[PDB]
Swiss-Prot record:
It is found in: Secreted. Its main location: secreted. One of its GO terms (molecular function) is metal ion binding. Substrate binds at residues 267, 354, 471-472, 516, 520. Ca(2+) 3 binds at residues 276, 280-281, 283, 288. This is Neopullulanase 1. One of its GO terms (biological process) is carbohydrate metabolic process.
């Protein structure tokens, strides 16, 4: 508010949204112009300090006043970082007389930060459809039986001395005596998904489907791959897949769609012919002979019974990637007929891969998270983007996936357990995604989100897979104790946050389910109608997100973190829209005075709460709205 030897943190702001960065994903020849907000006439000077990897040294860029905002409450200072192909990191030093403050990915700070700087990664690009879309994850056998003929009957075949069991739709997933939970088949197939595309792309509005493993394998989940080149018979054939894909891409049944498949490349099943532990093929697998033409595809500590695998499971033998140019790297991604390229090239042309157990991929039985692992994912990116520059690569990882993203040479994003799923679960349900006691306050929730977003470059942030639940954790509906309102609150946050909203089939209507396999129940189609509370809401929220680009690629600013009333408010905004989201995590309603002036919403202007449909007028830079307990408001203009 004045030159008083004091920098006012509350007026400061910067992130890589359109209002503050003119080149979020620049090439080697494009310079980056940055803008820093501050209260009007609050400072005397500001400087951009960036580290250049080409140089291994810091560089200084003095900023200059640029303009005021429409309300005349803030100033905007600007400075430009020169164009080059090198990766750079930056922070701001802000001065008002004898007062200095710093600011970077983690926000304001009195002392100079050493971590969490903003990222500039020349030529790094993540597909924009991923940034702007809504994903729907489907576990094939449990979504919808489109063709009951290809169904696996209770006794169709045996695996490791066990018959497969068919269950009636709606039945419990747990196997009956004499059977195994990994061999229970409810009947869902690709044909079904194809027939329910209308529900997916219209009723709900999602434009991206992500399917759990669909290739030939003996189990329910099918992560124990037997043949990467063939759609498993229980789901259909490769022609079925091609028809599904065509209908997904079609714009005659709704919005243009995108298909992402699960790529299990760290290991194969023990029944794959390269290994052939049960001798299901005339050929000789690695387990069968040390003279096998694929012996070197695996790592044996004591041939043939002790070998490298996924988390000690003997049914999942770990592939040996060797050095660059190896046969394994060839059949997985380098060869034209490899697994990755096959489905990315016509007649399939899928749109991306979700990398199962990505962190472990390595050579010689080692456990990844090393030089070799990253070199492999680097070669993987070149192979993929070489076929389709718009194909997405999302790696599975439960923590900070910075190591596979921040260099802009590996994945486009990752499964956001650490930056979305966990924090949300603990704030709303008082439990972690495992269903164990773990609760955080509103201030901790906000801190958690900011810290995790800071781990990633902005384009990676906008491409993260944000799901409330999935096939490896407990259902949100169960962690919430069956309280639908908690689901309401979660959906609203999900559809308005930074990252790709991902709906784990069933979650949109409150489906319950405990730990695997209880988290893989069949889909009750009598609940998949707007007549259902959660569904109607999901459809509305998806419509809201698709209506406002600020929700997908706009800036993010915290507006309120009230621990007593449990009120969380944040804004999403770009050059066109300004949206203030108000969430009520309490068990009783609260009337909140939203500080929309922080988003520069003009006084006397109006906003509409997209959740209730009610309209309001900005008075004294505020918006007073009564929000019901465990519910929210989306105030936009
Ligand atoms: Ca001042
Ligand atoms: Ca079927
Ligand atoms: Ca054999």
């Amino acid at each position: 508010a004045a030159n008083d030897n004091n920098v006012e943190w509350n007026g400061l702001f910067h992130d890589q949204g359109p209002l503050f960065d003119n080149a979020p994903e620049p090439t080697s020849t494009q310079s980056v112009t940055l803008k820093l907000r501050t209260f009007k006439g609050d400072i005397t000077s500001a400087n951009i300090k960036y580290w250049d990897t080409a140089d291994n040294a810091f560089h200084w860029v003095p900023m200059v006043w640029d303009s005021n905002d429409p309300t005349g409450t803030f100033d905007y200072w600007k400075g430009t970082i020169p164009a080059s192909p090198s990766i750079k990191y930056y922070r701001f030093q802000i001065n008002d007389g004898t007062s200095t403050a710093w600011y970077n990915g983690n926000g304001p700070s009195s002392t100079e930060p050493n971590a969490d700087d903003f990222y500039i990664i020349p030529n790094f690009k993540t597909p924009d459809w991923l940034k702007n879309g809504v994903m729907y994850q489907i576990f094939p056998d449990r979504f919808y039986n489109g063709d009951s003929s290809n169904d696996v009957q209770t006794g169709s075949y045996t695996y490791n001395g066990t018959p497969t069991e068919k269950k009636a739709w709606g039945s419990s997933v747990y196997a009956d005596p004499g059977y195994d939970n990994s061999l229970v088949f409810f009947g869902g197939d690709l044909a079904g998904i194809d027939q329910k595309l209308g529900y997916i792309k219209k009723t709900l509005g999602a434009n991206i489907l992500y399917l759990n493993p669909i290739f030939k394998a003996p189990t329910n989940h099918k992560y124990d791959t037997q043949d990467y080149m063939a759609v498993d018979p229980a789901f259909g054939d490769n022609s079925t897949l091609q028809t599904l894909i065509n209908d997904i891409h079609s714009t005659a049944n709704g919005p243009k769609g995108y298909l992402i498949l699960d790529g299990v490349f760290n290991h194969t099943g023990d029944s794959h012919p390269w290994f052939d532990k049960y001798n299901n093929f005339s050929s000789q697998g690695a387990y069968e002979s040390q003279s096998s033409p694929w012996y070197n595809y695996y790592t044996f500590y004591t041939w043939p019974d002790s070998y490298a695998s996924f988390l000690g499971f003997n049914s999942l033998p770990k592939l040996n990637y060797g050095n660059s140019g190896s046969a394994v790297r060839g059949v997985i991604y380098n060869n034209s007929n490899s697994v990755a390229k096959t489905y990315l090239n016509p007649p399939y042309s899928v749109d991306g891969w979700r990398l199962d157990a990505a962190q472990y991929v390595d050579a010689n039985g080692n456990n990844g998270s090393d030089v070799t692992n990253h070199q492999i994912w680097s070669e993987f990116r070149n192979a993929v983007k070489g076929v389709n520059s718009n194909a997405a690569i999302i790696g599975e990882y439960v923590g900070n996936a910075n190591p596979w993203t921040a260099q802009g040479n590996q994945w486009d994003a990752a499964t956001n357990f650490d930056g979305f799923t966990q924090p949300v679960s603990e704030w709303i349900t008082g439990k972690d995604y495992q269903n164990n006691s773990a609760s955080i306050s509103t201030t901790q929730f906000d801190s958690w989100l900011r810290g995790t977003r800071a781990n990633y470059p902005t384009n990676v942030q906008q491409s993260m897979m944000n799901f409330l639940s999935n096939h490896d954790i407990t259902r949100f509906a169960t962690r919430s104790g069956g309280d639908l309102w908690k689901t309401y609150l979660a959906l609203i946050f999900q559809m308005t946050y930074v990252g790709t909203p991902t709906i784990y089939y069933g979650d949109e209507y409150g489906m319950q389910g405990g730990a695997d396999p209880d988290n893989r129940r069949s889909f009750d189609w009598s609940q998949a109608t707007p007549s259902n509370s959660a569904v109607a809401l999901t459809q509305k929220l998806i419509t809201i997100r698709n209506q406002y680009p600020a929700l997908r690629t706009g800036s993010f600013m915290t507006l309120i973190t009230d621990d007593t009333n449990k009120i969380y408010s944040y804004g999403r905004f770009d050059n066109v829209n300004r949206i203030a989201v108000v969430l009520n995590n309490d068990s009783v309603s609260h009337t909140v005075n939203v500080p929309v002036w922080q988003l520069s919403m003009p006084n006397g202007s109006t906003v509409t709460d997209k959740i209730t449909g009610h309209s309001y007028t900005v008075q004294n830079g505020m918006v007073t709205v009564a929000v019901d307990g465990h519910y929210g408001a989306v105030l936009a203009q």
